[PDB]
Amino acid sequence: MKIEEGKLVIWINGDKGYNGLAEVGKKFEKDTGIKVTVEHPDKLEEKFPQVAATGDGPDIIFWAHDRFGGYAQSGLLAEITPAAAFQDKLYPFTWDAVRYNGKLIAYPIAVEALSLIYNKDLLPNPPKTWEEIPALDKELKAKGKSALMFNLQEPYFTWPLIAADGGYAFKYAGKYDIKDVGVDNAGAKAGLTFLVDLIKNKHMNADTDYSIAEAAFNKGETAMTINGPWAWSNIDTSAVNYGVTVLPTFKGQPSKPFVGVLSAGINAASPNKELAKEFLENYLLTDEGLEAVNKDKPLGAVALKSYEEELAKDPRIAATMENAQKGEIMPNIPQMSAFWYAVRTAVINAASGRQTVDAALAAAQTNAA
Amino acid sequence: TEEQIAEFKEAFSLFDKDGDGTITTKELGTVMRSLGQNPTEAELQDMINEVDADGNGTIDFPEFLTMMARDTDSEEEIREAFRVFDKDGNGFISAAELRHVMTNLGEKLTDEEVDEMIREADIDGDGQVNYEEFVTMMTSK
Amino acid sequence: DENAIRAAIFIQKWYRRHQARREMLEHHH
Ligand SMILES: [Ca+2]
Ligand SMILES: [Ca+2]
Ligand SMILES: [Ca+2]
Ligand SMILES: [Ca+2]
């Protein structure tokens, strides 16, 4: 309903296992006296700031961590107090996704990142290396196929390669440095130059977007794409004989995809902060709690070590984690908006030609302000 | 709000199927008949003259936007939208009825997306969307 | 009135929200 002292109200997006989360609220209600209402309102991540301290928010909100930094800056999130021994149960790198001004402000739940997706019928062994991809495309083009198609319009999709040799968004101990912006170092330039030589040498096309690349891979026309777990469901339906694996290296260095951590925050205006902590620790963030959620809709890879090791028996899950651990935590600061717009323009202009990779990156370096 | 402007531009595109920036009466009648309605050319022309401040025979997006802004009882319109989905009048929108209308409109959804739209709308978990559930989603904005 | 156009826009909202939601989960458009 509205927030009431002695009950919990939870917000989580419609695509997650909210009926699985409601089962965990039921068990919590069985054990304690405490009722739990799991809700999935539309646009909850937009409504939370409008409504947070008027009593019509939730005690608990699940979202991608990168929105929580803005929330924390507006004073909407309680500071979280998990003991050192609770924190050990989760992979250490996930705790770095839920800090703001050094303070913990959410519980990590699940982890997502881009991976290399490949057609095992067209390419039984995936390339370990970005550099070996052009040759592959020569071989596949001679069979009427192509090596690789992924979305070239969104910096989120091309950033794994631009970052591999030394690029980054803002330099990370436990706070971000909005001065130190790594889009113009030699690494970023070498990464984007390779991407651009791919297009120049006609191994990829600058206009390819999400829809174009998904259709191609799911019809068996290209041997690889780059995508996240959200995309597996359409690939299953396609019945393409596909694998999911670690991203190709570049100049011997791992591709560095952005990491997104589904996290649970506690409303700073809540009179149920202790019950919320109790519900999240040792009900949700447990093998059986994350399982009830996963059985409703799959979480992908999880922050909780013990249950990830079970889920990672699926090698697509193992691959998502392995790419996450090699990746860059998406900054949760609001200057990310300037970074996004800056780098979207640089890539489209550089890839569209008539724009020096060196020039576009210099201007993108500036436009983060 | 600019987020809502974009949402309305998408709604504009449903009618402007050739994407020339204008809505004709032919484009209007194509969508309404896709929804099982039976308008005359006169009712089609009237619907467009009401919005077309230019006098040319078409609605452009500024005209469309000005009109969307202009309110008191959207309840009727939402009820009318419910009734179009609920073609057998049994009080519940099923996956089949959702798919029926979306395919009539040219909206591409996989079976899983249809099922997922049903699930999220389906507050009480009976597997179908009743009127209050429909209203909950339609009024989020 | 413009009852029928508004009703049709309302009918389409279900698809707009699902589409916008899907794009954000797939990190694009
Ligand atoms: Ca037109
Ligand atoms: Ca006009
Ligand atoms: Ca029915
Ligand atoms: Ca229902």
Residue A37 pairs in a beta bridge with A9
C-alpha A121 – ligand 1 centre gap (Å): 44
Residue B22 pairs in a beta bridge with B60
**H-run or E-run covering A349:** helix A336-351
DSSP letter at B35 equals T
Q: Is A363 exposed, middle or buried (0-12, 13-18, 19+ CB in 10 A)?
A: middle
Among A227, A203, A46, CA closest to A140: A203
d(C-alpha B124, C-alpha B101), whole Å: 23
Contacts of B117 (CB under 8 A, 6+ apart): B98, B109, C14, C18
How far does the CA of residue A168 sit from the closest CA of chain B (Å)? 29
d(C-alpha A194, C-alpha A229), whole Å: 26
Please give the tally of structural domains in chain C. Answer: 1
Q: Which residues of A touch B120 (CB under 8 A)?
A: 14-15, 40
Instruction: Give the 3-state secondary structure of residue B110.
Output: coil
Task: Give the residue ranges of the annotated binding site of B for Ca(2+).
Answer: 16, 18, 20, 22, 27, 52, 54, 56, 58, 63, 86, 88, 90, 97, 122, 124, 126, 128, 133
d(C-alpha A25, C-alpha A128), whole Å: 44
Instruction: Give the 3-state secondary structure of residue A328.
Output: strand
Q: Is A278 exposed, middle or buried (0-12, 13-18, 19+ CB in 10 A)?
A: middle
Are the Cβ atoms of C28 and A228 closer than 8 angstroms?
no
Domains of chain A: 8-112+259-329 (3.40.190.10), 115-256+335-367 (3.40.190.10)
Question: What radius of gyration do chain C's Cα atoms show?
Answer: 12
d(C-alpha A351, C-alpha B119), whole Å: 41
Among A43, A366, A177, A62, CA closest to B136: A43
Are the Cβ atoms of C27 and A157 closer than 8 angstroms?
yes
* Helices B95-105 and C3-25: angle between axes, nearest 10 degrees: 100
Question: Taking a C-beta distance cutoff of 8 angstroms, is the pair A314, A321 a contact?
Answer: no
In the Cβ-directed half-sphere of B46, how many Cα atoms lie within 13 Å? 9
By residue range, what is the domain housing residue C13? 1-29
Q: Phi first, then psi: what are they for A65, rounded to 5°?
A: -60, -30
Contacts of A274 (CB under 8 A, 6+ apart): none
Among A155, A63, A99, A144, CA closest to A350: A155
Q: Is A2 exposed, middle or buried (0-12, 13-18, 19+ CB in 10 A)?
A: exposed
Domains of chain B: 2-69 (1.10.238.10), 74-138 (1.10.238.10)
**H-run or E-run covering A244:** strand A242-245
Token pair, residue B113, equals 């997306």
| Way it was determined | X-ray
Ligand nearest to the CA of B90: 3
C-alpha B29 – ligand 1 centre gap (Å): 12
Buried b (16+ CB within 10 A) or exposed e, A182-201: bbbbebbbbbbbbbbebbee
Cα angle at B10 between B4 and B11, to 5 degrees? 90
Our CA dihedral for A131, A132, A137, A142, rounded to 10 degrees, sits at 150
d(C-alpha B112, C-alpha B127), whole Å: 14
Secondary structure tally for chain B: helices H, strands E:
8, 2
Are the Cβ atoms of A40 and B120 closer than 8 angstroms?
yes
Query: At how many Å resolution was this determined?
Result: 2.2
Are the Cβ atoms of A209 and C27 closer than 8 angstroms?
no
Contacts of B42 (CB under 8 A, 6+ apart): none
Question: Taking a C-beta distance cutoff of 8 angstroms, is the pair A321, A229 a contact?
Answer: no
Token pair, residue A37, equals 């209402």
Cα angle at A266 between A33 and A302, to 5 degrees? 95
